[PDB]
Design brief:
homohexamer, 237 residues, alpha/beta, Rossmann fold, 9-stranded mixed beta sheet, 34% helix, globular, acetylation (chains A, B, C, D, E, F), purine-nucleoside phosphorylase activity (chains A, B, C, D, E, F), DeoD-type (chains A, B, C, D, E, F), guanosine phosphorylase activity (chains A, B, C, D, E, F), Nucleoside_phosphorylase_CS (chains A, B, C, D, E, F)
Chain lengths: 237, 237, 237, 237, 237, 237
């Protein structure tokens, strides 16, 4: 193959993990997958396919923003027979009780983008994740002794929004974390009949800017990828 | 007491099941609740409180439409300490594979209404259910050997829409059932910090054209009610 | 028989008075109509057909909100030959010089609902009543010695609006009363080819906070009814 | 003197007839007004003040489009004590049963402009005329033997609309005439606290394509004027 | 001839300069054109054709507002073979560094209007001028030793806006001048394949509050006119 | 430094060239810049600073989509004192007369994103480039014997849009090319007072899918970078 993915049917697994930063795709491939092979290099957006406890899995970065992940998720769904897409990354929190490094599952994703209105006759489309995929992630987290919060995410189109008051609105309606893809990926999944989920670890807090050692961020990132990988094995059962 | 509810703090359980039809409320109370007392009759919107296997439960109609159910769920949450509201109604299908008598659970709900937009600064609020309630519900239907699909519902403002092109859209983006309140109820729950879930049985198929009616229809409807009642018992454990 | 009305062409007169409260429909039929006969109880939305000074009149509640009265007004207009709908309901005042028990005639109706935008390719549709019906009502009022302000009403989707600033805007633009149906009825009448008028009794003040009290509500409630009924006779002449 | 009117408080009567065409203002002042005096020629937007059967009347063009008549109606209302504005203009018919020379009274006015949405927090404002003025006009018409339809007008921003399908929507909703000011005037009157009414003569048919012809345009043009003028007298009584 | 222009193919040049004021049109013609004949007077919108240094030029007012100038520019392009339209008006500044008597060229134009949205499927159409005309204009002002700023204009629907918060916005995003037609004219030009440019002199500063008036103001206004006339001579070479 | 740029004030030039694909930043640095140095590697988004004919210049990829380039352009403007941003990439054409490999300058950029409406109080912001930067690019192109088309670009948020009819609308309003950043970058520039320009070479054509050798695409890409680099030197004069 496609404009952004130079590969053929079969190169990708039916389950693709999608980190924001491409650099992270390689890290995932060599750290959690076995017998990994490179399946895409276009635009430096490296893609890998391999196995995790016998389960075939693919990993590749989806880029920053809704327009970006919309391209990749769509091509994967429609051209490589991808059934599930798990986005793994970070988010900013707005609720006082949502601490840093907390794991958040996007059962739903609010947004200020127009993609879904363009798709849904300018009405309100509830960009949601696949339920089974949400519960798998939650059960997997539980098994790893991790606490996982489930609820709405907010997919911002502007990391630097002109409306600083929107953060208060998000806080008032329970938004768990602010990121930039969920709403988009959920839109594509519904459009092409596939299943999607977004998992985020809280990076910063719009509140008091705390601090996390590079070691801690590393630990939390591996925890999230484990949740994702284990949730897939749960979904297969 | 409040404008639309002639009761006092205590008259309701902390969990309220809400069908659209007040007459259906009475039916629920006399069929599944023991020692059900009538706690409200204002505007004919019958409310009842009783016990289901020892747990205090209430059931009350919320009328038809987001504007209607918004008033009641809100007054329940803010004046009668209700912590959970489970809407138990019917819906029409648009997807071919969704058959009559199918039990649908609205993890999320799309909509025609402009209510959440008024709440979310004209942005996209993903009206979603409470995850634990969705899961409790799924597990209960499972214990009763009932197949329940989880996904998106569509909350229409107009039961007689002037544009039927919207149905192809709902179908394309996978909406499981068409009703008229979920989006409103999930908006209220988020706005006032409560938890809500909407469970529906398909009573019509806007596709093959067919409105269910038989001992079978009534059997499935009661299953939905038992899934709702049983889900609170699970939420308790 | 339609989906929400178990009646047959003929059970309803060509004009129907419609309060939001089903119990009011009943009260009206008992207090002002002769030979009152119940013609509908589906969903407890009581309907009646009687005689007023010899004229065949019908009265039936329509429920709370645009979605609700849209269903009932539509069904009446298309399956029961109803030519005129007169909504006789309650509203909230926002102007200082408007006090409880005041009777307002909605020559027009503003709204925050999306129904009409949906019907009008997203442009501005001026939800307006039928001129002769407004004139009849104004004339019926003078003949009764009752005062009645004619002007704009505001049909709200959220009785509990999270946007309090909007009331200031309504005030500045002279909204006489805040209710929840007008714009919808006027929307339906235009779409289905019938005529409608909304008469409302100020049951409370949005600024001062005063609900219906004393025995005053009754006669003023009856004033609205008297006006609606007489205006029907003036229209016949 | 305001930015667009070189006059002084007093040069204008408390009611002003306003055609879109400055040359019509002139014709009206010469044909129907006694002691006509020019009170404005800024931007060639001719204004006059005379006497009609003893009543001080004023007539001034307002130009084409909402932005234009918004400026003039505003300036008149805030700096020249004008209490009533009667727009006497031309419109296009869209309904089959509406033919050239027909006189329509805009009880309300739909529009595709954004002015009112701007004034009304993006909600629906029902641009409506002053009831008594509409009633006066209807009465003045019967006394003249002239026919006049009362109802909705549609104020268009684009005389040459690229959206032809919209005319079908207008037709379905009974728009009596398509013009370019009503919604604006009604918008201004409400905002600045004055009263307005629009009377229009069907100068052409949007479906059949027929513009003003023969000597008929004149008397029918004069019919509208006669009605507007008389209605002013009825209002005085 | 067309509804608003009483002329015949040929009466105009292929280039029309358009001030908002018809009286200003006459002023242009008698001041800069040789042997100017009047080619239109319908509705008082004076149009003139003459020659500037041997090149055939026309000048005509377009009235005030997008709805007004849209009608005229359109009829000029589609019925009188006009290929270029140069609006020459005034504008108010919002930016501190923009002083009175400053010549502004609208490379682009923002707007309040809903016209382009009707044209562009509710999306964002960037109303822009014709590049060559902008450059011709810049070069001409340069040859005349005049400093001309190029940028965005704001086309307001309401000269008396109900929200002054919009001015801080225009200023923040760098809008150079506030007028009422450019966006409309650029929309028409694109819709009918013509070329348009809007040149403005700052006659008011909504900031320091100051409306220019002196021999100086009139001197700058004539410069703008010469920049416009001279720009066509350049476009020819 | 910033969340996405790990560098300090001074590391970047006041002029930054921004290709879509990061891989292209390195190619530009080693092919057209001298004494280049790496200034950013975060997320693999490589940035370089160096000189072109003595002129200090920086190059770095901005990623795919408005949300992405919005982040980088903003941080560069506000944290590294960047004055000008030139985006260099490709686009799809919709006009029959726009051939492949044609150079297009985005004087303006239409879009279906909501970023500018969020910024401009939901009104129409004309996302435009800096004029001088546009003319420099055009003159530079001319000097290289290259033909450059100037006009509107369309910044799509969905590379795979559900509305296939939008391409016809774009064609009707002269859109020169379809890409995905312009509107966004122009928005940020206006918000933070900097200058921006977008240059694109036509890659595909929504019409007949022609073909271009890798050699030809290489030649055209170098031509575009030369235009950009030379336009900067022209802007300095």
């Amino acid at each position: 193959a496609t404009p952004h993915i130079n590969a053929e049917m079969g190169d990708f697994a039916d389950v693709v993990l999608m980190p924001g930063d491409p650099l992270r795709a390689k890290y995932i491939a060599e750290t959690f997958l076995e017998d990994a092979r490179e399946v895409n290099n276009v635009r430096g957006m490296l893609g890998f396919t391999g196995t995790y406890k016998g389960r075939k899995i693919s990993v590749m970065g989806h880029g920053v923003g809704i327009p970006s992940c919309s391209i990749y998720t769509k091509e994967l769904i429609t051209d490589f027979g991808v059934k599930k897409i798990i986005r793994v990354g970070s988010c900013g929190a707005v609720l006082p009780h949502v601490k840093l490094r907390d794991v958040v599952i996007g059962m739903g994703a609010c947004t200020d983008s127009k993609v879904n209105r363009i798709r849904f006759k300018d009405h309100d489309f509830a960009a949601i994740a696949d339920f089974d995929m949400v519960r798998n992630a939650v059960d997997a987290a539980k098994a790893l002794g991790i606490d996982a919060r489930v609820g709405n995410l907010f997919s911002a189109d502007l990391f630097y929004s002109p409306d600083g008051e929107m953060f208060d609105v998000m806080e008032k309606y329970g938004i768990l974390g602010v990121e930039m893809e969920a709403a988009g990926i959920y839109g594509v999944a519904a459009e092409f009949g596939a299943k999607a989920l977004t998992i985020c670890t809280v990076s910063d807090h719009i509140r008091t800017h705390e601090q996390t050692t590079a070691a801690e961020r590393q630990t939390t990132f591996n925890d999230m990828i484990k949740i994702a990988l284990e949730s897939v094995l749960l979904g297969d059962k």
